[PDB]
A paper describes a structure:
Photosystem I and II (PSI and PSII) are two multisubunit pigment-protein complexes embedded in the thylakoid membranes of higher plants, algae, and cyanobacteria, and carry out light capture and subsequent photochemical reactions in oxygenic photosynthesis. PSI and PSII each consist of core complexes and its peripheral antenna systems. To maintain a maximal efficiency of photosynthetic electron transport and to avoid photodamage when exposed to excess light, plants and green algae redistribute the excitation energy between the two photosystems by moving part of [name] through state transition. In state 1, the PQ pool is oxidized and [name] is bound to PSII, whereas in state 2, the PQ pool is reduced and the protein kinase, STN7 in higher plants or Stt7 in green algae, is activated through cytochrome b6f complexes.
To understand the molecular details of this large supercomplex, we purified the PSI-[name]-[name] supercomplex from [name] in state 2 and analyzed its structure using single-particle cryo-EM at an overall resolution of 3.42 Å. The overall structure of this Cr-PSI-[name]-[name] is composed of two moieties: the PSI-[name] supercomplex and two [name] trimers. One [name] trimer ([name]-1) attaches to the PSI core by PsaO, PsaH, and PsaL subunits, whereas the other [name] trimer ([name]-2) attaches to the Lhca2 and [name]-1 subunits. On the basis of the cryo-EM density, the complete structures of three core subunits PsaH, PsaL, and PsaO were identified in the current Cr-PSI-[name]-[name], whereas these subunits were absent or not well identified in the previously solved PSI-[name] structures of the green algae. In addition to the protein subunits, we identified 332 Chls, 83 carotenoids, 3 Fe4S4 clusters and some lipids in the PSI-[name]-[name] supercomplex. Based on the higher abundance of LHCBM4 compared to LHCBM8, and the fact that deletion of LHCBM1 does not inhibit the state transition of [name] we tentatively assign phosphorylated LHCBM4 to the [name]-1 subunit involved in the interactions with the PSI core subunits. The phosphate group of pThr strongly interacts with several residues from the loop region between helix B and helix C of PsaL. The phosphorylation of the N-terminal Thr residue of the [name]-1 trimer in the stromal side upon state 1 to state 2 transition induces extensive contacts of [name]-1 with the PsaO/PsaH/PsaL subunits, which stabilize its binding to the PSI core. The [name]-1 trimer in Cr-PSI-[name]-[name] is more adjacent to PsaH/PsaL rather than to PsaK, and moves around 19 Å toward PsaH along with a clockwise rotation by 40° compared with the position of [name] in maize PSI-[name]-[name]. [name]-2 has no direct interactions with the PSI core subunits, but associates with the PSI core through Lhca2 and the [name]-1 trimer.
Residue numbers in the entry:
A (entry chain L): 38 to 196
B (entry chain O): 31 to 123
C (entry chain J): 1 to 41
D (entry chain D): 53 to 196
E (entry chain A): 12 to 751
F (entry chain C): 2 to 81
G (entry chain H): 31 to 130
The structure:
Amino acid sequence: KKAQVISPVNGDPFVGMLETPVTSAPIVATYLSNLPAYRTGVAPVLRGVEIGLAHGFLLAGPFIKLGPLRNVPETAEIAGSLSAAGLVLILALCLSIYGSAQFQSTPSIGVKTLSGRSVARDPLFSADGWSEFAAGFLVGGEAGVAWAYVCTQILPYYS
Amino acid sequence: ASNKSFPRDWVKTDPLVPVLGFAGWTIPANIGVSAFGGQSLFGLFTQSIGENLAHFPTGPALDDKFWLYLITYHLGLFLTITLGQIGVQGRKQ
Amino acid sequence: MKDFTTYLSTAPVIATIWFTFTAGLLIEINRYFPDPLVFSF
Amino acid sequence: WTVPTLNPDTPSPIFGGSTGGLLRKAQTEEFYVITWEAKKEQIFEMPTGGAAIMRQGPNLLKFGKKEQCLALTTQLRNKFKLTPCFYRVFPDGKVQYLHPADGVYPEKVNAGRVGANQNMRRIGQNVNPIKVKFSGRMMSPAEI
Amino acid sequence: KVKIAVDRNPVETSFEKWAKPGHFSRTLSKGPNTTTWIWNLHADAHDFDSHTSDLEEISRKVFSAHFGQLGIIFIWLSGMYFHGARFSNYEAWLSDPTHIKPSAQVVWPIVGQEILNGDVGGGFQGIQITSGFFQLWRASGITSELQLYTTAIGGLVMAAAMFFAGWFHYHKAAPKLEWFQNVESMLNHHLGGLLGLGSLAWAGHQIHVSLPVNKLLDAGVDPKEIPLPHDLLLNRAIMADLYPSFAKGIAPFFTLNWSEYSDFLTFKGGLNPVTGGLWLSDTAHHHVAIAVLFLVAGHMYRTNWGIGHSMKEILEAHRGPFTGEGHVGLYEILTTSWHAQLAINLALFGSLSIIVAHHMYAMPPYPYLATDYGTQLSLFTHHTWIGGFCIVGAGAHAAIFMVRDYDPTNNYNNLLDRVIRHRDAIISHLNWVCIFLGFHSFGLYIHNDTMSALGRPQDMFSDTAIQLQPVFAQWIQNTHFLAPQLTAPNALAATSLTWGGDLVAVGGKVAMMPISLGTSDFMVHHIHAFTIHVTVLILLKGVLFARSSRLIPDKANLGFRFPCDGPGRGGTCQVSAWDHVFLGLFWMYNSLSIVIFHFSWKMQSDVWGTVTASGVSHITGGNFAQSANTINGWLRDFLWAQSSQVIQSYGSALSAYGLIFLGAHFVWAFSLMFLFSGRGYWQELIESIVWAHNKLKVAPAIQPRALSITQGRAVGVAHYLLGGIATTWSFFLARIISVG
Amino acid sequence: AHIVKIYDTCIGCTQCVRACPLDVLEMVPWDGCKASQMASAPRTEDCVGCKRCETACPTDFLSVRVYLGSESTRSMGLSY
Amino acid sequence: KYGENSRYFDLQDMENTTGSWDMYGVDEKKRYPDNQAKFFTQATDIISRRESLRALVALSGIAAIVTYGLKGAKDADLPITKGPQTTGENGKGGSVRSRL
Ligand code: CLA
Ligand code: CLA
Ligand code: CLA
Ligand code: CLA
Ligand code: CLA
Ligand code: CLA
Ligand code: CLA
């Protein structure tokens, strides 16, 4: 009764998205603004190392706990960390060839923000920016997995 | 139509919805029946919460007569708050 | 009664009647003459 | 009848916002824009799902592919008896007119049309595919 | 103002239209010219919306057709009671339920089928039944074949009554429309009258016949010496001998002193230890409470007096912030369309059937039911399958309502509208969860298979290696086993023995023992969840994309049933909602096959078996917890090990199953021609054979045409389901009739 | 783009035009039949090849054909 | 004008009427303390191109797998010179005829 929560995107009912308290709630919006993949003003190398540090450190775990070397003591950590570094390596290769295939042609035309003003295009979406991002990912991921081993070896009540 | 922009207040916070929620549900949740021998559905697993808070890192047993208290307690606590929030009769009833 | 006879003249009814006739005929022959394999007679 | 252009300040019908609107075929390649003038307010059916309310007067929509504009055109034409027209819009400010593109919808014959893709032989007077073999590309014998 | 509104003599009674096939529609009427017209005559016979366009006539049609269905059901029941009366060994079964197996069918001594007459015990020969009418009849109190014969005659009479009723209400007194559109009166009368008064009447019959007769039968006296039930009605003092509350008559009831009826209206929990069924006093008390509940519920709606609810008011009051106008406009949908009603009713009806199956194995209600293994397996399986088919039907008719009877002008901003308006989010997330469950639920089995074949059984998911415990179900199991001491203070036992506790053994065999849940149970349960979600995906996608989609913007104008929209835009085979129903049928087959396999093997491994007074020796030795994590485990221990009886049944009195096995396979493999191929090839081949007839002047003057695309698909799925289900039927019955 | 060709057995009954869901067919004046009309396909770059034009043609073996060819982003009917 | 009383489709303003918005994309500087720009951009200077890190992954992948062959002898469970320490199925070959 003269109360509604769910709205179409910025007016405009003819773009295939509609706004919900899942997508456009304020705390969710500010949260996903503050993630490194949406910042647009920083150099892509640094985003690469942040994202890599995060993903390597999380990728180390399951190989440690559930890998085929998980019951033999004191070497269950080594094989897991090494395998995780291998996975990060392959992810870096995937990023490189994606850069070779995606941005290989002309970019798009135009972009505006939601509360309309003409914002410029993100420099991550050019060939150079993406390649730099991939290098940052490799560095960050390997550093993260190495830190996972380090963190295992010196940590109060790890088990 | 439905709207043109998402309102950044959709949960209209009335401050005495939650306090009446759990305060007006727990003050009658600890009465005392013949059913438990003189105990409540808020003090009988206060014993439990503190009881397996004593031995801390051991997660409590997977048949221990108090998961029932947790589940049947929240099954009513959430319900009374979700019917309290529809005590926004500001335009409807 | 003419239309009832014409209804009895439709395809599935005559299929049912005629296959009942043929089936029953073979069944009776197999009762009174049990287990035929060769003709020799 | 000359070829008309559109006036992009006409209002749009009331609608809630579907999933099935414009995706990024519109951002890079093209999207189609339909226009008609109604006489009385009425509820019609979108060719994506849901129901919308057309306004008293000129209206305006936008769609992804062409079969959507043709579906809405057939529905608005055989059921409500109106005269819609839909355009093609490229994503830089280029507007192309189509349907009818002759003034008259293409069933009533309008003198002054040039017939294309119009062979002048019986269907079984085509050559064998051995006599069109070894050409620049794959060819059907009835394409020559 | 709800009242009677009937028209007089609308359609006269003559055989005139029986000699004019296809009289009902305008298209069919002109007579055949191809063989497509025969299949069109049979395809549109019950499509009552495709004769006319008026509600009243359709409603009268469906009313009289309902009468026809009821009549045929009565003929069926009458047949069952008659065959029980004349061609069975029911009395010899009552004399000794163990060691005498139920048989109710006798074959004629012809070409050699007389070997099918098995030695069922009791000086009788015939085919063992698993339908379990004998336990039902003993639960009702039937002791003689004469009463069965009388019931048979009564059933036949009621059948004739039903057919006459149908004739009367279509031809002589046919109701108007607004008779039908009084749904509130129908709700009151069904809820009160049918359900409630049926419960109350059956409670009466139990209290006055089934309690005492079964008390005497379980007391040990043979059935002939037991007094006839009219002596139990007429003589109060015999009931006073059995249950002393009856000596006080009906005085306790009317003065609210109900505590004195504690002799025949009880609340004890588990089972009858001498019988294996439920306590009949509980059953009577149950129907009494049911009847009071339903008779109370039936006075809810407004018919002619001011009291009661209106459906429109209730619906229109429920609307929130997240859903716009809420339910405004569902009453007009649900009183003017029959397919919507058929959808809802088939849905809840089929789900109800499956719940029937589950409760019916868990808490066996009939006397001497739990130790007849074949009956248990057959009843659970049968109700499972019927539930599945009905739910798929719900999907189909919801789709038909989406195509035909949906009008968006009366339905603007609404729950139905908003569901249509975010179908993309709905189907995308349902797709995601299907894939997630797929990978995990089936990859666990592939991983266990690989690890168990590579020499390392320590890296597979099992009870001894990496463990996956269903902690939730175990906790709920213990909760309900503990319920009679805290949360059900007045029961003497749990509601079933599967929640835990002791063992009930009747005649050496096991009635029910507690069931444990381990890792194999975890994995199979997630398999069930996976297949259910996939079927939901297909059917719900069919419903939502029935009117239009991004691919076809005008799919509504092509109708409900259509084959394609050409090879264009890539190719658009199978875009109708009908084909979504088709693929749904396949997946329903898959999911339910897994369910009944799970039940069969779990029961044979952890519940049934003999109490040899040396512990319990189950039928298959209890190998479910170790083998149900490898596909090789299922294929070997279940399919290959348990088929030894169905393949070696030749020469015994069980060979019909080992002979219908192969035929079921044959039909299954025969379906594939219809599924794989296409009709153009068959059209050309049929044309060449038509030439071979044109040579000899045997050209049929009706024209041979190949089947249409939709019919070819439908016939394919028909043969597929028939063959698969017949195979499973043969296998189950041979196995459990042989060793059970 | 596909290949749509109109042949001379056409009687000009406008069924193909009313069946086309993309407006690639139109009726042009002609002096070869009783109706003095004939179909034509001036816009075969919008055709998707659904073959409703073939289904709507009354004259036996058809007076209109749709030959399938190299697909594009418009002839696949892709809306995304 | 686009953002008005249901006046959609502004022809010259295409980036609204099309659906090309940045949903969650903010743009400002100083996300990081300054000298990580130094420590990480002077660290990824070598592999900052298409061929460079793509050569690096080749170098490391080879120098890892080839050495895994002959120094991944940390039991590999079975094969690597731990071998069959029992004469496993030499004479056991057939069931009816032995055949070795
Ligand atoms: C012929 C192809 C092939 C080969 C040779 C292997 C070989 C192997 N597989 Mg494998 N696999 C294959 C195909 C193959 N796979 C396919 C097709 C699949 C999909 C079905 C899988 C799925 C699969 C799974 C799921 C797993 C394996 C695992 C393994 C390892 C088992 C050895 C062991 O006991 O763990 C000993 C393992 C180690 C000692 C770790 C070595 C890690 C790499 C080889 C070293 C990397 C060096 C380092 C990162 C370089 C530094 C870079 C620098 C920038 C810092 C071994 C390396 C296991 C594994 O490694 O995961 C833990 C495992 O769990 N495989
Ligand atoms: C609906 C369930 C049902 C089923 C599945 C059966 C099945 C069977 N009954 Mg049975 N029966 C039923 C109900 C049923 N009955 C009822 C309700 C009664 C009480 C009236 C009986 C009384 C009964 C007796 C007394 C006997 C059987 C017997 C049999 C068996 C052999 C039947 C036979 O040889 O037919 C013979 C074949 C025919 C009669 C062919 C008739 C086909 C005609 C020509 C079709 C014409 C088409 C026409 C338009 C439609 C029919 C209309 C109708 C009004 C005639 C068979 C297992 C026999 C048995 O068990 O022996 C051991 C037996 O003696 N039944
Ligand atoms: C107490 C009254 C009463 C009772 C018992 C029923 C019972 C039934 N109605 Mg019903 N109905 C009622 C009032 C009642 N209705 C009213 C007031 C209306 C008008 C609003 C309708 C309108 C209605 C429609 C439109 C339909 C039904 C249908 C049905 C049947 C559902 C099938 C089923 O599961 O039955 C289980 C089977 C049985 C219980 C067998 C017992 C059958 C006997 C004959 C008891 C019937 C009592 C009878 C209605 C009382 C009047 C008898 C007559 C001689 C005056 C069921 C027999 C459906 C049906 O099947 O149509 C035939 C159907 O389509 N009813
Ligand atoms: C709905 C089913 C049902 C039915 C049919 C009955 C029927 C009966 N119960 Mg009963 N009962 C039921 C449910 C039922 N009960 C339930 C649910 C309970 C549990 C609370 C009980 C508990 C119970 C007890 C404890 C006792 C009975 C008893 C009786 C019998 C006598 C009732 C009595 O004292 O007079 C009640 C009076 C009437 C019902 C009036 C009947 C009016 C007649 C039928 C009208 C005929 C008029 C007509 C014009 C005649 C035509 C004349 C001409 C044509 C010839 C009677 C057979 C008593 C009995 O006999 O025990 C064996 C008894 O002691 N019942
Ligand atoms: C209460 C149950 C119920 C009712 C009343 C209806 C009623 C209807 N359905 Mg429906 N349906 C149901 C359940 C039901 N269905 C279920 C459970 C399913 C899922 C399988 C379907 C799936 C379904 C589809 C897919 C379609 C319908 C359609 C229809 C309509 C036309 C039916 C027709 O002409 O059949 C004519 C009768 C037949 C075709 C009989 C043939 C049935 C099979 C081949 C026989 C079964 C074999 C048998 C078990 C074993 C063979 C024995 C021996 C010969 C070997 C009609 C309104 C059609 C429609 O368009 O609606 C408008 C349609 O397209 N229904
Ligand atoms: C056994 C045969 C088989 C299999 C495996 C599938 C598999 C699938 N069908 Mg399916 N289908 C089949 C027969 C089969 N179908 C038949 C006969 C029909 C006709 C009725 C259908 C009709 C049908 C419909 C109508 C639908 C599906 C859907 C699905 C998907 C469900 C999601 C899922 O579980 O994916 C997970 C994948 C698997 C479980 C396959 C096994 C994967 C293994 C275990 C791990 C893979 C990792 C691999 C080893 C790594 C590769 C290494 C290599 C490169 C070296 C899935 C792709 C539904 C769908 O797509 O929506 C979700 C859907 O709508 N199918
Ligand atoms: C079980 C599997 C199976 C069977 C039985 C057949 C059978 C046949 N196929 Mg084949 N086919 C199959 C699978 C199968 N196919 C598959 C999977 C494919 C891939 C798509 C094909 C593709 C295929 C093609 C492309 C062609 C065939 C052809 C044929 C026919 C060959 C002639 C012949 O042997 O006559 C023997 C015929 C039979 C054994 C049919 C059974 C008839 C039964 C026994 C009579 C009915 C019994 C009883 C009355 C039924 C009562 C039930 C009642 C309710 C009606 C025959 C009908 C060819 C054909 O038609 O050439 C003439 C042909 O062109 N098939």
